[model samples]
Target: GSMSSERVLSYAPAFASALATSFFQELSRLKLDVLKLDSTCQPLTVNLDLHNIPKSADQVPLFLTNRSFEKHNNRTNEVPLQGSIFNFNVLDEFKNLDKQLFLHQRALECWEDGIKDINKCVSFVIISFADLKKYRFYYWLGVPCFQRPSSTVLHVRPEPSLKGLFSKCQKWFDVNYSKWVCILDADDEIVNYDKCIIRKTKVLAIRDTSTMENVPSALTKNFLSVLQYDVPDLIDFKLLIIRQNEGSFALNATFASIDPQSSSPDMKVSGWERNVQGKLAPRVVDLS
Candidate 1:
């Protein structure tokens, strides 16, 4: 038989509950969705109680301290804590609650080590609401670091398409200022075979900053501040400055090859472009 506790194990569930509360609160503030996918990757679901809301201090689960679980195949399943993706800022807030919290340490290290040159250490998973059935398809942001720059283009086009997904996420981005959840890859182009058109979509290009920098704070505070920005609602025809080297930023706007298409009434940015251009050019902009 397992040894039983003879003495009183006095501990406050309040601490556990507080941590969980803080955890979910930050996730909500960040506008994230916690979808519990089955191991087979079907029958996905979310817990309304814990989706963005934390459990009460008295109701906090003990296992959550070192584990996370989800409902799969009509039963509860354990999911890898490390498999979960979170923003570095989220981890920083979690750490602020307590320095001894080891649950966040791994997530912290994942981004902490790569701030100086974010592209060298950063990566992203591209998901589309259009294909919620296969939303798990992810693309690495820093493709040039791993493969050839020419090879990083996403070929498979979804029903709603990546451009539609980007525009939708962009709307969400406009409302949610606290979270930097969406980044557009304006540098790359995606083909929409369904529409028989090739469109210039904004993309989030990530790189590996891990091998380049050892200092987390410097990268978090100074470097990411400069390189990262929300996608502008209006393209000012100005240059995009994303990288810094040789005491200057990389002038990417000029290098960007934007293939502006003809405008249609149904198109989202069509009116804006025409208004800005004042009949100089009627452009139809498609972004994913």
Candidate 2:
């Protein structure tokens, strides 16, 4: 079947982390069992015992042997050290089904990579030690997605929400704790509004004063009025005038309230004299 364009399954990082921990812990327990006196000690052999596997998953045992182990006694011998490697997941019955549940297609690729050099290897699969003499035993185990669950039911994805200023800002708060700001619409109000205070405010509006014959008298008394010198019980406020080019969208913005008195220091005001004589003089061109 063809793969769906939309993703149906999502990987959980936290779940994978937990799964990896369980896998290694289980591997250690099995390794200890193999060292026990009564445990099976067969040289150049691999076992997939269901009893030793994690309770969270089913077991698939894989066993393989190369030509090197058949003729060479490198386990304890001091000879040139030609080691025998055992590759599992060689057969369907031996592959880890838990891994397949998460990586549906890539699991097949793992098997292909495992068997590429099998023909050149010198080892043979040993089911029992009935014929071979006493030799040192060693087992090497590898796991893909060690933190992944053996079952699909353990995986989960995060649900969407509209709790904070914006979706991105909400996510930022989830992963970070540093202070941040979010641009909001004119009518938008923060939740629990009375809990905080606004120290400063700035409103941006587009207008062409030359086009109007007379400005309204009420405009001089409103909070947004420019000619009024009345400073209400506010920390700071400013009006930024911008010209809208012909055919361009209106770039208007409501007053952005700045909270906290400490942050308001950076928003302090300087008169137009500084603009005409100081640093901004280079950019303040006069139009005759």
Candidate 3:
């Protein structure tokens, strides 16, 4: 998220192109659903025709309403559109508990921002990815068919692994993810998109380069590096993750997820080396 408007636009075309080469084909195999809400917070319409599911009466029964923000801030004239609510490891009712990986808190915050304007909005939503292969046990996934989302949004905090761990995780878990958002120790970006354009205005600012030397490097090389050159080889490898077809909404804000455990040997108070350089190499600055 740099401040340069022209840079943001310049990045879009290539980014979208990279996404098409890198992730869009896999996205096509999966299904997409769109949910429309009426003024009263009731479902005005639903689009599930892509999967050939009969559009009978009440095909999808369950409806979930998540309101994260509290009451409006009348004095500041700022309305609390959606309150902050999180799935604190609660949705474990689904099977293969170990298989379901939780996103880092930072990434989830991105998805939460898409629908934070509920006061003037007709309806709100959350995506739930269900594996069609496991349709026999759909209920076990913790949501009813009628109330299922048209698409699911998954936020991922990817590790620096050559194994392409996130893709592996998606395939192994049969994940139906809508979009893949990545935030590293340095920064984050919308890793996957099509022909869409993103526009935004900033109210606050912080210097990542001063505090953190190589934030943009992590954005480009770590994420884009894999996509830019090796896209064809990457495609041959197959997409392990499938974004269950869902609608598109901007995830404007996000909160960070906690590191549940610290197995690092350097956790002791009296650390041996604060500036230790292990096997990992230091990131170099690259605005090119």
Which numbered prediction scores highest in TM-score against the true structure?
A: 1
Per-residue error (Å), model 1, residue 235: 14
lDDT by residue for model 1 over 113-161, one digit each (tens)? 3333332232211111111232221111000011111111111111223
Please identify which of the two predictions, 1 or 3, would achieve the higher TM-score against the true structure: 1
Instruction: Report lDDT per candidate.
Output: 0.22, 0.22, 0.19
- In order of lDDT, best first, we have 2, 1, 3
Write candidate 3's Cα lDDT for 108-146 as tens digits. Answer: 232233233111111112222223333211111111011
Candidate 3 stretches greater than 4 Å from native: 1-85, 89-100, 104-211, 214-217, 229-288
Of the candidates numbered 2 and 3, which has the greater TM-score value?
Answer: 3
* Candidate 3 least-lDDT 10 residues: 9-18
- Candidate 1: segments with Cα more than 4 A from true spot: 1-63, 66-112, 115-182, 186-223, 226-288
> What's model 1's overall lDDT?
0.22
TM-score of 3: 0.15
Q: What is every candidate's alpha-carbon RMSD to the true fold?
A: 25.5, 32.1, 23.8
